[PDB]
Design a protein around this ligand. Structure first.
Ligand SMILES: CCCCCCCCCCCCCCCC(=O)O
Ligand SMILES: [Cl-]
Length: 133
């Protein structure tokens, strides 16, 4: 299952190409400005086989709870209503979000103790790096 090393509180330390990723998602200008300024904390926890990923920032908080491989309803930080599935591939926690015939993926993996989130939409790729608090 998901490595226990994912469990805990993570702080954003680096964000590359987030503005173009937000553009690809249809996020408007004023929202992108705040999005690019945000330095969220991400908290990963687990109760039995239910995994929870909570994001906290001054601008927006989000939270998803899910079982691996089972599709669930999600509300994203930019207020999309998606149907999502989180899978595990070679240690990586891979989230796919589907809405209005569109799709984006967020793959989270551990690299030398950091958590790296790769966000992909229509050929645009954003990389966000988190450090364990
Ligand atoms: C709380 C994150 C930024 C707030 C700005 C909200 C509007 C755009 C963000 C939508 C996509 C968020 C993807 C985050 C991926 C990650 O966990 O690093
Ligand atoms: Cl913030």
């Amino acid at each position: 299952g998901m490595s226990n090393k994912f469990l805990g509180t993570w702080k954003l330390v680096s964000s590359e190409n987030f503005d173009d990723y937000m553009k690809a998602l249809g996020v408007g200008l004023a929202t992108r400005k705040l999005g690019n300024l945000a330095k969220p904390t991400v908290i990963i926890s687990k109760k039995g086989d239910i995994i929870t990923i909570r994001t906290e920032s001054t601008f927006k908080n989000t939270e998803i709870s899910f079982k691996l491989g089972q599709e669930f309803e999600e509300t994203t930080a930019d207020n999309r209503k998606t149907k999502s599935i989180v899978t595990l591939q070679r240690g990586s926690l891979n989230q796919v979000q589907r809405w209005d015939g569109k799709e984006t993926t967020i793959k989270r993996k551990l690299v030398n103790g950091k958590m790296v989130a790769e966000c992909k939409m229509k050929g645009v790729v954003c990389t966000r790096i988190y450090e364990k608090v």
